[PDB]
Structure formats: C-alpha cells, structure tokens
Design a protein around this ligand. Structure first.
Ligand SMILES: *Cc1cc2c(cc1C)N[C@]1(*)C(=O)NC(=O)N[C@@H]1N2C[C@H](O)[C@H](O)[C@H](O)COP(=O)(O)OP(=O)(O)OC[C@H]1O[C@@H](n2cnc3c(N)ncnc32)[C@H](O)[C@@H]1O
Length: 527
C-alpha cells in the first residue's frame, strides 16, 4: 500500500525500513519485500512519480534542474573551482534515477575488483557484481552471444539508435582520431573507444528509474508499505545503540512521527543526505557534531569525508547545419580515451550533447547559440577529495557541500581536464566533422595555453552529477571507513547504508547502474 498521509498509518512497526526511495533504496526495499513473510517500509521525502509526465518522460530531464523536484544544493566557495556550480539532487520517488539522463553502464571489472583488493571491502569484486548487474537488467543486447546480460530484470536497458547525423559524424571523427567504435557493457572495459550509449529507458519513452522498475509493480503488495512526502529528521537508537527506527515529518513545521524496525534500518538517502542524517543522529566526526550541539553517539571520523565526483568541463561549438530537434536524452554519446600509456581504465571521458551547454559560461560572457553542440570532458578518477558537513543542527538547513574541485596536490584533475579540452578540439577538427563543426563558442580559439585553459576550467566547470563516497565501506579496522564490508554502520547495531555514499573509490563510468547494483547487494547481504 501507498501511504501519502502518515496520520492514517496506525501500525508503524516493520521488519525493515529503507530511508530514501532512490537508485539504491528502491532496489533494497523491493528485494527485501520478495519474501511475503517480511514486512518492508520505504520512506521517501519527495512525491510519488506515478503519472507525473515531467519525471516519467526521459527526454524532458533537463527541465527538472532547479525545479520543485530538485533539493538544489549549491556548493561552498571553491578554492580552485566554480563557486556557482550546483549539485542538483532529485526529490521524488526514484531519487536521481528519476531526474537523470539515464546513461547506463556496468562498472569496469578493474574498479570493482579493487574495492576488495585495494580498499579493504571484503567480498566486493566483479565476481559479486556481475550476477547482480544480470539480475537487475533486461538488456537489449541479451542473448547467447552476450550471456553476461540479463534478459529478465526490472531495469530495462536499450541502445540509443544512431539517428543523430552529428552523432554518427562525431563517431566517424573519433575513428579518424584513432578512437574506434566500441560496444558498451560487454563485460570488457572500454579504455579507448566511443559509441552511442545504452540507456535505462523503456520502449515508450518512460525512464526505467528505480521507482518505475522496482516499485510500481509492487505498490499493492501486502507486505510492502510506500510512504511518500515524508522527510527523515533523525535516526532513533537504544539504550544499547541499536537503531530502532526513524523520525519523520510531513511538513517542515509539523508533528514528528516515528517508524520502527524490528530487524534493520537501511539508509539510502544518497551521498549528500546520508552523511547529513547520520551526523544529525549523532554518528560522525565528534568535534563537528559537538560544534552543533549534537550528542556524539559514535565518533566516526569518515562520515562526510572522502567526497568524490567526476568534475566536468565544456567545449561548445556552433553547428554548421540544423541540429536534431528530437532525442532520447540530448547526451547520447560517450567517448573514452587514455591520456597516458599503461592504463587498464581510461582516465578521461567526454560526453557529446546535441545542445549548447551554457549553464556556467553564460555568466562569464561566452557567446550563446540556439544551434550548436557540446563536448564535455570529465576526469574518471579525480584525485581531489571534499566534504559534506552540517550547516547547523537543524535538519531543514541544506548541508555544506564542498567537493574541493581541482585541489589534488599533484594537479592530476586539472591536467586531465586540460588534455580533455584539447582532445575535444582534436576530435571536432577531424574531416568527418567538417560539415558540422562551426565556431568554438567556449573557451574559444583564443584560449590556447595551459594557463588559459586552466583559468577557463576553474571558472566554468560543472559536474556529471556523480557525488559519491561520503560514508565509505572499508576494512573493519579502518577508523576512517564508517561502514564495514557488509555495509553495517560501525559503532551501532541494526543500521546499514546502501547508496552512492558507500563507494571507497569512484567508478570510471556513470555510476547509476552500479548504485542500483549496490542496493541489490545490500538486499543479499541482509537476506
Ligand atoms: C541528478 C543527476 C544524476 C545523474 C545525472 C544527471 C543528474 C542531473 N547523469 C547521469 C545518469 O543519468 N546516469 C548515471 O549513471 N549517472 C548520472 N546521474 C547520477 C546518478 O543518477 C546517481 O549517482 C544515483 O541516482 C545516486 O543514487 P543514490 O541511491 O545514491 O541517491 P538518490 O539521490 O537517487 O536517492 C536518495 C533519495 O533519498 C531521498 N532523501 C534524501 N533525503 C531524505 C530525507 N531526509 N528523508 C527522506 N528521503 C530523503 C531523496 O529524495 C532521493 O529520492
């Protein structure tokens, strides 16, 4: 059942409570509910997405940025970055799977294998993840010639059709620059290669969000309770520091209600809101909690530390012919290439967007167009590390999000981004793109030196919208990892975290499907 008025829920005790109906949370809640003897509550601050066209129709996604569907988290002033940048985060069932571009990737095996081998996360490797990617998806590429693929899972992945002529020409241009066409999600990492994406979208244009995929089919299940429009303000603990449930409100100034869990509570509020909720509940860096008058239940210094992202630059071009006016999601191609020899993962990625992306260039006076395209390089393994911290002890105050972009001491992130702008220019300049590439609008051909491109990047960079890593898993004995390898919050019992917070190291690719995989694995670790 769907509860949209908490005042009518009389029995508020469940076996499991999942907090946050996002990419991971929806998956955890649905998988736990597959046992009819187990009762599960899924609590989400935003509305139900059922029948909401702006959310459901993927090609409308860019309209959700800074809408009522967006928590809208501006960042703290950046030491070496864009202080105007905003971390858009969805406030709606499905979480960011309901506001995103649906770019769908399996993580490289080399990334996942390292979670265990390098970062102490016992049991987290490609052997554990491959069957879960299979289980979660219905992939267009499924079949005996690609037996790793799922053909039955809730999350539908399809290939973006090569309809966009500028896209086709860009791929031809990649080939000329020595970047071959490569299939994505084959099980083998693409180090040097490019193509139209796979996207998690259904045939009819509906995003295959975690809510559409996992939740809509089960809303009437007898053992499943969906609670929307309800915002968690604190986790509640014993006595013996067992998490017994969660305090929620239906409106900022209203009565506090509580839901209780007999077995466990799973926190899935994502990489920004998770560390915030833990800190408000007394789990976090002791000095920071004390500063805000919060009783320290667990001194957990890794909470809100190790914030990682894929920082993003932009190169914008006027197009010499009419650009496409229809799309799956306006960002249909990805390009991977290594900037150095010896790599088993690309250190650089670029997206191609069939629109001019002027979000951060217009304010700095760069020219605009209504007929143009963008190439957006990102750093796949940024070395910079930031924080999420409390602004105050009041749950209604937005957290302080400081990614510390381009602050890594060896200057890796900036070096790769500069290479990325140069590589974007190189691809755009190939013969196959001669009939497309017009004037470069930003940074503009006048920007040529390392220094000029660095200044431009600092002023105008965005994000691919991939904050991760703020409540990382790690070795039981590592004090700076708030979670053990089974996602259990250290220092407390009955509480796990499952969402993008958990990643010890960012993945090379767009993380959404991997975060769904994290939810699948959390369900399994529990059951
Ligand atoms: C937002 C966004 C995200 C992404 C992209 C663009 C944009 C604008 N681009 C690409 C994408 O399309 N594919 C991809 O692989 N990566 C991109 N994408 C990032 C992913 O979408 C993102 O990493 C995952 O969605 C993260 O999932 P996770 O489960 O970690 O978090 P999510 O935000 O989905 O769910 C959290 C839910 O929790 C609710 N919430 C938050 N705070 C509370 C409180 N206090 N009480 C109750 N619920 C609460 C949020 O409303 C979310 O539903």
């Amino acid at each position: 059942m769907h509860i949209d008025n908490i005042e009518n829920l009389s029995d508020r005790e469940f076996d499991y409570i999942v907090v946050g109906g996002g990419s991971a949370g929806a998956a955890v809640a649905a998988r736990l509910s597959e046992d009819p003897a187990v009762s599960v509550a899924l609590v989400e601050a935003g509305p139900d997405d059922r029948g909401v066209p702006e959310v459901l129709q993927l090609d409308r996604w860019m309209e959700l940025l800074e809408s009522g569907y967006d928590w809208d988290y501006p960042i703290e002033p950046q030491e070496n970055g864009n202080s105007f940048m905003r971390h858009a985060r969805a406030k709606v069932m499905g979480g960011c799977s309901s506001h995103n571009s649906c770019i769908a990737f399996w993580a490289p095996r080399e990334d996942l294998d390292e979670w265990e081998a390098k970062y102490g996360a016992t049991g987290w490797n490609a052997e554990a993840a491959w069957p879960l990617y299979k289980r979660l998806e219905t992939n267009e590429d499924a079949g005996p010639d690609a037996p790793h693929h799922g053909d039955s899972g809730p999350v539908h992945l399809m290939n973006v059709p090569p309809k966009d002529p500028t896209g086709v020409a860009l791929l031809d241009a990649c080939e000329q620059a020595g970047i071959p066409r490569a299939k994505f999600n084959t099980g083998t990492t693409v180090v040097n290669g490019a193509n139209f994406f796979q996207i998690n979208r259904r045939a009819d244009g509906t995003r295959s969000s975690s809510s559409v995929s996992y939740i809509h089919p089960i809303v009437e299940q007898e053992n499943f309770t969906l609670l929307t429009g309800l915002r968690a303000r604190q986790l509640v603990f014993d006595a013996d520091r067992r998490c017994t449930g969660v305090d929620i409100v239906d409106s900022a100034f209203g009565h506090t209600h509580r839901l209780t869990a007999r077995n466990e509570v799973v926190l899935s509020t994502g990489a920004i809101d998770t560390p915030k909720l833990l800190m408000l509940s007394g789990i976090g860096p002791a000095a920071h909690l004390a500063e805000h008058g919060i009783e320290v239940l667990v001194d957990s210094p890794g909470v809100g530390e190790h914030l990682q992202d894929h920082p993003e630059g932009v190169v914008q071009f006027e197009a010499k012919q009419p650009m496409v006016a229809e799309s799956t999601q306006w960002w249909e191609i990805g390009i991977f290439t290594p900037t150095e020899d010896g790599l088993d993962r690309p250190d650089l990625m670029m997206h191609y967007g069939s629109v001019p992306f002027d979000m951060n260039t217009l304010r700095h006076g760069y020219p605009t167009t209504e007929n143009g395209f963008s190439l957006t390089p990102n750093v796949t393994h940024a070395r910079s590390r930031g924080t999420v911290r409390l602004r105050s002890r009041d749950f209604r105050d937005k957290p302080m999000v400081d990614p510390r972009y381009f602050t890594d001491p060896e200057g890796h992130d900036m070096r790769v981004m500069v290479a990325g702008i140069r590589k974007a220019r190189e691809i755009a300049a190939q013969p196959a793109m001669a009939e497309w590439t017009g004037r470069e609008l930003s940074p503009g051909v006048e920007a040529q030196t390392d220094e000029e491109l660095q200044d431009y990047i600092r002023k105008t960079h965005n994000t691919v919208y991939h904050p991760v890593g703020t409540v990382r898993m790690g070795a039981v004995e590592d004090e700076m990892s708030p979670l053990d390898p089974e996602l259990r919050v250290k220092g407390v019992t009955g509480l796990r975290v499952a969402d993008a917070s958990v990643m010890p190291e960012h993945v090379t690719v767009n993380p959404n499907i991997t975060v769904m995989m994290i939810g699948e694995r959390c369900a399994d670790l529990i059951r």
